[PDB]
């Protein structure tokens, strides 16, 4: 709803710095020994 | 300036010709992607060796 | 001003719409089944209504 | 249980449509063979020397 919570307390939009992460499978072409 | 009514009857008469009789069309789009291509035809399964 | 070895001059009849069926390497009803026009034809083709 | 004489005849009536008439297809197929070619034009035909 509209309504933000009571215990909501306001504070600075922290971050930090991903390091090698977001790695998935982008096909289903197998491979070996190689740097597709 | 040329965006009159665009969606237009077709005209399927008994004394037309044959070119514009009705023709119900099939169109089976078939194809080869990189996943895994589960989908065949009636083949027997054979042994291996 | 040419010279040929034979002339076969095939003599039939058929409908308007399927005018368009005879032809070199075309398909058709009457194309498939009754008189199919070969790809390498090099004659002429005279049709009169 | 569609097994049908597939021999039908043409209707050429006076009733039909344009698509539907009777036309007169004559297809003379011309080609040049290794035998000597006797089908030629209105060419004035030259000795030899």
Known sequence: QCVNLTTRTQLPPAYTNSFTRGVYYPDKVFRSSVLH | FNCYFPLQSYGFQPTNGVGYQPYRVVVLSFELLHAPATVCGPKKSTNLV | ?49
């Open chain 3, 1 to 49: 001003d040419l010279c040929f070895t034979n002339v076969y001059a095939d003599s039939f009849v058929i409908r308007g719409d399927e005018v368009r069926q005879i032809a070199p390497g075309q398909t058709g009803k009457i194309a498939d089944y009754n008189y199919k026009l070969p790809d390498d034809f090099t004659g002429c083709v005279i049709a009169w209504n």
